[PDB]
């Protein structure tokens, strides 16, 4: 309901707008190597920290991609900013990619805390799963070649960098 709408809104209002322009931005950054594809982190616990290096020190901020701008609903030159991270493994750089969390999962988290939202805290997991499955279904028929969904459930020793590396290595 909320998850279904969030997945559609994230796709329509964000991914549909950045993904067609992403490959050219990465090619530009590389010519001035960062992997292609936006790697989207989908923690099913809906824990969305703003600083990726805090979630895993082995996920190290490298640089920002050149920004994309577009006139969007009266916002002239609405800016789309994306960050490049290096993934470390036993002190070695193992991968470089454009990475971010899916921000609707932070909305699901925050909504469950507001009494007026009518969203119970114990419904978070079911809604996160529906969000991930819906987004997967959208991207299958859309965008798909320009991004990779990294959905995961934390157990208490978990490596976020290893989770991303497993997806990055699958691309060969």
Q: Which stretch binds a copy of itself (CB under 8 A): 18-26, 28-36, 62-70, 148-156?
A: 62-70
Q: What share of the chain is helix, strand, coil (3-state, %, to 5)?
A: 45, 25, 25
Q: How many residues bind ligand QBD (CB under 6 A)?
A: 11
Residue 20: beta bridge partners? Answer: none
Site string for a copy of itself, 89-128 (x = CB under 8 A): ----------xxxxxx-xx--xx--x-xxxx---------
Cβ neighbour number for residue 68 with a 10 Å cutoff: 18
Q: How far apart are CA 170 and CA 84, in angstroms?
A: 19
Residues 6+ apart with CB under 8 A from 129: 3, 44
Using CA atoms, how far apart are residues 28 and 130, in angstroms rounded to an integer?
35
Instruction: Tell whether residue 78 is a contact of ligand QBD (CB under 6 A).
Output: yes
Interatomic CA distance for residues 127 and 107, integer angstroms: 11
Q: Is 73 in the site for a copy of itself (CB under 8 A)?
A: yes
- In the numeric block, which tokens belong to residue 52? 């990726």
Q: Which is nearer to a copy of itself, 36 or 112 (CB)?
A: 112
Q: What angle do CA 73, 118, 110 make, to 5 degrees?
A: 60
Applying CB under 8 A, among 22, 46, 48, 97 the residue interacting with a copy of itself is: 48
If the CB atoms of residues 9 and 67 are measured against ligand QBD, the closer one turns out to be 9
Question: Hey, is 74 helix, strand or coil?
Answer: coil
Q: Candidates 25-33, 64-72, 88-96, 164-172: pick the segment binding a copy of itself (CB under 8 A).
A: 64-72
Q: Which stretch binds ligand QBD (CB under 6 A): 2-10, 48-56, 136-144, 147-155?
A: 2-10
Question: Is 6 a residue that touches ligand QBD (CB under 6 A)?
Answer: yes
| Residue from 41, 42, 104, 135 in contact with ligand QBD (CB under 6 A) | 104
- Give the residue carrying structure tokens 């990475």: 99
Question: Which residues would be at the binding site for ligand QBD (CB under 6 A)?
Answer: 6, 9-10, 13-14, 72, 75, 78, 103-104, 107
């Amino acid at each position: 309901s909320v998850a279904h709408g969030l997945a559609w809104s994230y796709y329509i209002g964000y991914l549909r707008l950045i993904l067609p322009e992403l490959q050219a931005r990465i090619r530009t950054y590389n010519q001035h190597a960062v992997s292609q594809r936006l790697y989207i982190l989908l923690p099913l616990d809906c824990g969305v920290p703003d600083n990726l290096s805090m979630a895993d020190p082995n996920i190290r901020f490298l640089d920002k991609l050149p920004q994309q701008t577009a006139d969007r609903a009266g916002i002239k030159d609405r800016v789309y900013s994306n960050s490049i991270y290096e993934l470390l493994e036993n002190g070695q750089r193992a991968g470089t990619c454009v990475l971010e969390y899916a921000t609707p999962l932070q909305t699901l988290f925050a909504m469950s805390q507001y009494s007026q939202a009518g969203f119970s805290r114990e419904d978070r997991l079911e809604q996160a799963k529906l969000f991930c499955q819906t987004l997967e279904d959208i991207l299958a028929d859309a965008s798909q070649n320009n991004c990779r969904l990294i959905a995961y459930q934390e157990p208490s020793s978990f490596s976020l960098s290893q989770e991303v590396l497993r997806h990055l290595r699958q691309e060969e």
